[PDB]
Amino acid sequence: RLGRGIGSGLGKTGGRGHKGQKSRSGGGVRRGFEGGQMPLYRRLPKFGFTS
């Protein structure tokens, strides 16, 4: 139970750190986001087919 006082050890920030995307309500990047670069599953080429 985060954000329930100093003694709990998870108060006033809820374990989210300080003013990042993870600290915003509904914040955070999608799966595979690499900071702006095209992710590895897009740097690498497709191969093969499904039989």
Residues that bind RNA (CB under 7 A): 1, 3-9, 11-14, 19-23, 25, 29, 33-37
User: Toward RNA, which CB reaches closer, 32 or 47?
Assistant: 32
> What does the binding site for Mg ion look like in residue numbers (CB under 5 A)?
9, 17-18, 20, 23
User: Toward RNA, which CB reaches closer, 35 or 48?
Assistant: 35
User: Toward Mg ion, which CB reaches closer, 17 or 28?
Assistant: 17
17-36 burial code (b ≥16 CB/10 A, e <16): eeeeeeeeeeeeeeeeeeee
* Residues sharing a CB contact under 8 Å with residue 11, sequence separation 6 or more, in sequence order: 2, 3, 4, 5
